[PDB]
Amino acid sequence: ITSAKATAKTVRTSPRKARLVIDLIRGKSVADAISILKFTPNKSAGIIEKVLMSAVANAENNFDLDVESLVVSEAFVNEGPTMKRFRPRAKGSASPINKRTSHITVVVTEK
Amino acid sequence: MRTTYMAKAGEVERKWYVVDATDVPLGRLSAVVASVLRGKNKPTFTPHVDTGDFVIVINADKVKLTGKKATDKIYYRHSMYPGGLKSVTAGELRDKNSRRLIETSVKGMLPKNTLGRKQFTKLNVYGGAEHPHAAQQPEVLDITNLI
Amino acid sequence: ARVKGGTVTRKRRKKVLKLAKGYYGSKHTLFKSAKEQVMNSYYYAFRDRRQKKRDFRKLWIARINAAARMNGLSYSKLMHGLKLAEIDINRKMLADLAVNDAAAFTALAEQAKDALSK
Amino acid sequence: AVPARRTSKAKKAKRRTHYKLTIKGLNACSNCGEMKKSHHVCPACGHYDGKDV
Amino acid sequence: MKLHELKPAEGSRQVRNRVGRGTSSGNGKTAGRGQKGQKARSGGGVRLG
Amino acid sequence: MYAIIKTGGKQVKVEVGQAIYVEKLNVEAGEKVVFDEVILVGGESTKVGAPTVAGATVEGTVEKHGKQKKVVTFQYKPKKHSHRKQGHRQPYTKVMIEAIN
RNA sequence: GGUGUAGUGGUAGGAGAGCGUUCUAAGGGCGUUGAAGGUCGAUCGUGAGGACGGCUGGAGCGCUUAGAAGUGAGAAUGCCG
RNA sequence: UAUCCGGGAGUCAGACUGCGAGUGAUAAGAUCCGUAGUCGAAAGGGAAACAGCCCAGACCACCAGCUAAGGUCCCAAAAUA
RNA sequence: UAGUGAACCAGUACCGUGAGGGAAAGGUGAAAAGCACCCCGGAAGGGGAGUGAAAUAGAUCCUGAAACCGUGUGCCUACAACAAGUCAAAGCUCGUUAAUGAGUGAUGGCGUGCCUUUUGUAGAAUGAACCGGCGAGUUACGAUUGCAUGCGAGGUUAAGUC
Ligand SMILES: [K+]
Ligand SMILES: [K+]
Ligand SMILES: [K+]
Ligand SMILES: [K+]
Ligand SMILES: [K+]
Ligand SMILES: [K+]
Ligand SMILES: [K+]
Ligand SMILES: [Mg+2]
Ligand SMILES: [Mg+2]
Ligand SMILES: [Mg+2]
Ligand SMILES: [Mg+2]
Ligand SMILES: [Mg+2]
Ligand SMILES: [Mg+2]
Ligand SMILES: [Mg+2]
Ligand SMILES: [Mg+2]
Ligand SMILES: [Mg+2]
Ligand SMILES: [Mg+2]
Ligand SMILES: [Mg+2]
Ligand SMILES: [Mg+2]
Ligand SMILES: [Mg+2]
Ligand SMILES: [Mg+2]
Ligand SMILES: [Mg+2]
Ligand SMILES: [Mg+2]
Ligand SMILES: [Mg+2]
Ligand SMILES: [Mg+2]
Ligand SMILES: [Mg+2]
Ligand SMILES: [Mg+2]
Ligand SMILES: [Mg+2]
Ligand SMILES: [Mg+2]
Ligand SMILES: [Mg+2]
Ligand SMILES: [Mg+2]
Ligand SMILES: [Mg+2]
Ligand SMILES: [Zn+2]
């Protein structure tokens, strides 16, 4: 009743690289987090920004919370399903390639 | 019953002793001082807790070296660079840096661990008969019978 | 009549892991490393249940020696004197008195010195 | 050369200690008050040094 | 006798001994065959006589 | 006041109103037990048994009989495909000290 | 069952006695008022191991006696994931 | 305790130490025997560390005691006897 | 991971010039009642609202272990040389199958993994990246010995018929 969460599942991005941007914004006011994500050039910044804006929209529309008070109480990236691929190498062999996916969760609380 | 007394850090009082090294063999002085620093002279001795007393050594320049140790006892140390072995005779150490002589002797007799190094810090050596620790109200510690 | 692996294997390995709880990283997480460390822990524990008695007797002897020196006597002289005086108080009780009841330990030392003199 | 021993989680995390991002130079824009990078045009209002561009 | 209380005569039946099922059983690992040699191989041993 | 008594091949310090754990005593719970081998009595004065204080005794009541935490003896020799596991729970008697004489 | 005496390191290996797994028969039971399974716990036995409670789970499963084995894994540059 | 009768094995690479010989050079942690011990298959204490040396054979619990080899100024228990 | 290679569009996909070789892959719910409508988003995916007994049963759908990854934090950690434990232990934190409790642990003592093969291995000899599953003295017919049962100078049926 005081918090709202948004999740983006099976997003094609490195969980570790995404966790870098998530560490930037964790435990910050929603406005500060939005600014940080907008000015971060890393790819996951935009995806995390969409999830954060979705969470804020949930907090407002679904639960009628005060936007100005909102802060990023929790945020994390879990590993998702990994697609298997193969890259040919020299001398007629192949090496596996792990195309990773991420479950990005953002939880925003009133205070 | 598991009732053996175990000392705690800070509860036990550490006194301050003054030891005169004048014409006392280096090793025997170091041995008595090492026991005192470890706290082996007090019933409350606890091996895993520091319980010994501070020691101030005076007249370190007059410590005794029997035999030819003054010229033949050689202290080595390696810089860890190739061919980086350095030496200095015990007599030269006594003449120039007596504090180092006593401290090296006592280091050898203290345990080689965290507690041992902390106990070593409680040592204070001074060539000459005067020390700056009058504020600690140290008391003389006769050792003639302890050596 | 086929008997598949079932749950017995998991039960056994989980027992080992619970014993290994608190170990560093893989030593508490992985069954094989956990079992090896638990075996070494058993070896050390059996050995230490015997070393522990040695260590405490050693500690009591040291404390009794300090108290005896303060009373004007060596540990060896004190024990010999107590044996002569027929005192059977053991080293655990002697060290306890030295730390706690200095007066009682002093009385014991006086009796030991008297026996030695005789 | 190949890793003689696998890298444990603790050592791996220690090495990644310094593998972190940073965000610097953000401060309020004069024209609209939104956050902007210093010495850069405020992307929202397109103003810099108090003028539109 | 009752089917829920059957009881063989004492010593009439014994338990089969299974080898290669742990060290503490006394027949683990080598299964009582020893170490190496011809008799330690599957189908090992020389013909009778 | 306090006493030191000989019990179970070991010497224990005892004070009135204190519970002590000793090797199993062949006595029922809630029954009186008397330790008649007092090797010392201390307090305001000191009585030193040589080896035992004459006519000195300590009284107690057997509160409980119990078993200590299990001890596991696991003997094995590396590379010799051999191990032996054993459990133990030493019985004990908890006795409350009532009187020291 | 009690007292006494003596004994109780152990590889190859021999002997004895047991734990646990799946299934069969009989008897006696347990389960949408929650089985098996999973997970947690500071529980019991001399050992393999056995209970009990919380949570998860959603339909089968113990117990006693006897019987039959695809009956116990940590290693095989083992196989598959 | 020995025989005998029968069921089941494993073993046929040994090592060192002391003593008595050979081969060797009166060398080898060499080699080959005889003999005794230990290791092998033996944990514990001493020899700094150190399978084979010295003392000694772990069924277990104890924050009890006496000793063996070896030790008692400090590391480090015990004599600055 | 069993059972036919194949419980499923399998001798298929795939591999090979060809003969030939040859897989993986079962489970929503009683019933699709398979999430109308609204909100963020380009979508994907979510948050509400609903269906349902249950949606952390939402189609990667029963259960959902371990490795592996991540979040939060009760305790410890930047003078320390560590087969990582064990024995002793202050401090701090917590209150259990209520037990002479639990977690963590400054500090001190002791201490060179497991397996294989060896006279001898911490071994700078061998094997294991980790976790999970599978994976090795069995059966048939005979021989012989022990144990047990029935009968006993006797014992016993085989094929075959019902
Ligand atoms: K055999
Ligand atoms: K393997
Ligand atoms: K010989
Ligand atoms: K479900
Ligand atoms: K953690
Ligand atoms: K330690
Ligand atoms: K090699
Ligand atoms: Mg090519
Ligand atoms: Mg298995
Ligand atoms: Mg002893
Ligand atoms: Mg059978
Ligand atoms: Mg055997
Ligand atoms: Mg094995
Ligand atoms: Mg083999
Ligand atoms: Mg061989
Ligand atoms: Mg053989
Ligand atoms: Mg079942
Ligand atoms: Mg099997
Ligand atoms: Mg495996
Ligand atoms: Mg030789
Ligand atoms: Mg061998
Ligand atoms: Mg030995
Ligand atoms: Mg060995
Ligand atoms: Mg024995
Ligand atoms: Mg003695
Ligand atoms: Mg000493
Ligand atoms: Mg669930
Ligand atoms: Mg599921
Ligand atoms: Mg330093
Ligand atoms: Mg520090
Ligand atoms: Mg060799
Ligand atoms: Mg390897
Ligand atoms: Zn602006």
Instruction: Please state how this structure was obtained.
Output: cryo-EM
* Nucleotide with smallest C1' distance to residue C25 CA: I84
Q: Compute the C-alpha angle F60/F63/F68, nearest 5°.
A: 115
Cβ C6 to strand G below 7 Å: yes
Cβ C42 to strand H below 7 Å: no
Whole-number Å distance between alpha carbons of B39 and B7 = 11
End-to-end Cα spacing for chain C? 87
Q: Which residues contact A3 (CB under 8 A, 6 or more apart)?
A: A59, A73, A107, A108, A109, A110
> What is the CB neighbour count within 10 angstroms for residue F74?
16
Query: On chain H, which bases lie within 7 A of the protein's CB atoms?
Result: 9-12, 41-45, 58-66, 72-80
Name the β-bridge partners of B126. Answer: B58
Nearest-CA distance from C67 to chain B in Å? 5
- Tell me the torsion sign for CA atoms C110, C113, C117, C118: positive
Between residue 15 and residue 34 of chain E, the positions with Cβ below 7 Å from nucleic chain G are 15-18, 21-23, 25-34
**Neighboring chains of F (3 or more beta-carbon pairs < 8 A):** B, C, E
Task: Evaluate the omega torsion of the peptide bond into residue B47 and state whether it is cis, within 30 degrees of 0.
Answer: no
Q: Compute the C-alpha angle B32/B33/B39, nearest 5°.
A: 95
> What is the CB neighbour count within 10 angstroms for residue B21?
25
Structure tokens at F68: 């200590």
> What is the CB neighbour count within 10 angstroms for residue C80?
15
Whole-number Å distance between alpha carbons of C67 and C69 = 5
Burial track A94-110 (b if 16+ CB lie within 10 A, e otherwise): eeeeeebbbbbbbbbbb
Does residue A104 contact residue A22 with C-beta atoms inside 8 Å?
A: yes
Q: How far is the CA of F26 from the C1' of G3 (A)?
A: 16
Separation of CA C33 and ligand 23 centre (Å): 21
Show me where chain E is broken: residue before each gap, C-N > 2.5 A. none
Cβ E16 to strand H below 7 Å: no
The residue assigned the tokens 């140390």 is B77
Indicate the resolution in Å: 2.9
Structure tokens at D49: 């040094």
Burial (CB count within 10 angstroms: exposed 0-12, middle 13-18, buried 19+), residue B23:
exposed
CA distances A92 to A95, A97, B125, Å, are: 10, 16, 75
Taking the Cβ of residue C29 and every Cβ of chain D, the question of whether any pair is shorter than 8 Å is answered with no
Does residue C77 contact residue C68 with C-beta atoms inside 8 Å?
A: yes
Structure tokens at B6: 């175990």
Burial track B29-55 (b if 16+ CB lie within 10 A, e otherwise): bbbbbbbbbbbbbbbbbbbebbbbbbb
